[PDB]
Amino acid sequence: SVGLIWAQSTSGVIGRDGGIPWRLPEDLAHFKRLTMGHTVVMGRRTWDSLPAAHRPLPGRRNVVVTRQTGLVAHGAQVVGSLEQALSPAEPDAETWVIGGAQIYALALPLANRCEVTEVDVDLPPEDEDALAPVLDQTWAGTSGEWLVSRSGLRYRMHSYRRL
Ligand SMILES: NC(=O)c1ccc[n+]([C@@H]2O[C@H](COP(=O)([O-])OP(=O)(O)OC[C@H]3O[C@@H](n4cnc5c(N)ncnc54)[C@H](OP(=O)(O)O)[C@@H]3O)[C@@H](O)[C@H]2O)c1
Numbered sequence: 001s002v003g004l005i006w007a008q009s010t011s012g013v014i015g016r017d018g019g020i021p022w023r024l025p026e027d028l029a030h031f032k033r034l035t036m037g038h039t040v041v042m043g044r045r046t047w048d049s050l051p052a053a054h055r056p057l058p059g060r061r062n063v064v065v066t067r068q069t070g071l072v073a074h075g076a077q078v079v080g081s082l083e084q085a086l087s088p089a090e091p092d093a094e095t096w097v098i099g100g101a102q103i104y105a106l107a108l109p110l111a112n113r114c115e116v117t118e119v120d121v122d123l124p125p126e127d128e129d130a131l132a133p134v135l136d137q138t139w140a141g142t143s144g145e146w147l148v149s150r151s152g153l154r155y156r157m158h159s160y161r162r163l
Pocket residue numbers: 005006007008013014015016017018019020042043044045046047049065066067068080081082098099100101102103104130
């Protein structure tokens with residue numbers, strides 16, 4: 001199983017200024033619960049965005065996709081394409097593509113599941129924003145209820161699978 005997992009504003013923003021432009025603890029907990037013990041595949045810019053105590057992401061096999069063949073990434077496995085990342089020498093029952101926008105676009109045709117957090121935060125897109133992939137008619141999904149975070153934002157989780 002190859003899955004994508006992301007959190008987006010309702011406007012589709014996933015990233016700004018090298019980070020994520022909201023604070024949603026319940027989404028971090030969801031992300032940890034879904035990914036712990038599994039492989040997490042990410043683009044190099046997402047690797048560089050990880051906060052210090054989470055670079056590498058603890059308890060997960062971290063795989064970083066870069067064209068920089070000689071790149072040192074302590075705590076992660078460096079590979080040269082998304083296809084390499086999805087062709088491990090040691091297979092994993094679950095592989096999660098964890099971003100960013102560039103890598104999601106390449107991974108979506110190869111994936112069978114998407115786990116999406118929708119965040120009701122008003123962020124009109126700015127020119128350098130990273131944006132979420134869009135799910136077309138080849139995907140179908142289910143939505144959780146709208147919830148309110150202890151930190152204030154409304155949010156909800158969606159689970160999509162390839163038809
Ligand atoms: N809200 C969320 O769920 C979420 C999740 C993840 C990330 N984010 C945010 O998204 C942003 C980062 O996303 P991004 O789209 O800018 O970058 P990204 O997808 O994380 O990384 C892009 C990098 O991946 C490498 N890459 C891309 N295509 C490749 C290919 N065909 N072969 C080999 N390497 C390839 C390149 O690395 P090199 O330049 O090293 O060659 C490229 O610069 C940040 O703001 C981050 O905080 C948000």
